[PDB]
Amino acid sequence: GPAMEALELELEEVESQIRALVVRRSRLRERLLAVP
Amino acid sequence: GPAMEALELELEEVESQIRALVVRRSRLRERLLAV
């Protein structure tokens, strides 16, 4: 129903935002290893 | 040096954001599994 659909959408959003932050974290860690 | 210090700060910021989003993910999953 509507309530489940709303929650499922919110879950998809949060998962996508986490994936993006994790890519950023990996990139920043790579950089950290590239400076003095 | 300063470049490492800057990257370490950004890494702290990103981690805090991830941790908060992971808690939300858990809460939402819980609700759906409570159906």
Numbering used by the authors:
A (entry chain A): 12 to 47
B (entry chain B): 12 to 46
Copy text verbatim from the article accompanying this structure deposition.
The first structure is that of an N-terminal coiled coil domain that we show to cause a dimerization of the molecule, an assembly mode that is clearly distinct from the trimers formed by the LINE-1 ORF1p. In analytical SEC, the N-terminal construct indeed shows self-interaction and we find it to exclusively form dimers, whereas the esterase domain remains monomeric at concentrations up to 75 µM. A proteolytically stable fragment of the N-terminal construct gave crystals that contained two copies of an antiparallel homodimeric coiled coil per asymmetric unit, and the structure was refined to an Rfree of 21.5% at 1.55 Å resolution. Each α-helix comprises five heptad repeats, confining the coiled coil to the region between M15 and P47 as we would predict from the sequence. Because of the charge compensation between the highly acidic N-terminal heptads and the highly basic C-terminal heptads, we presume a preference for the antiparallel orientation also in the absence of crystal packing constraints, an arrangement that is clearly distinct from the parallel trimeric coiled coil formed by the LINE-1 ORF1p. Whereas coiled coil domains and their ability to multimerize are hence frequently present among ORF1ps, the resulting assemblies can differ significantly in terms of structure and likely do not always have a common evolutionary origin.
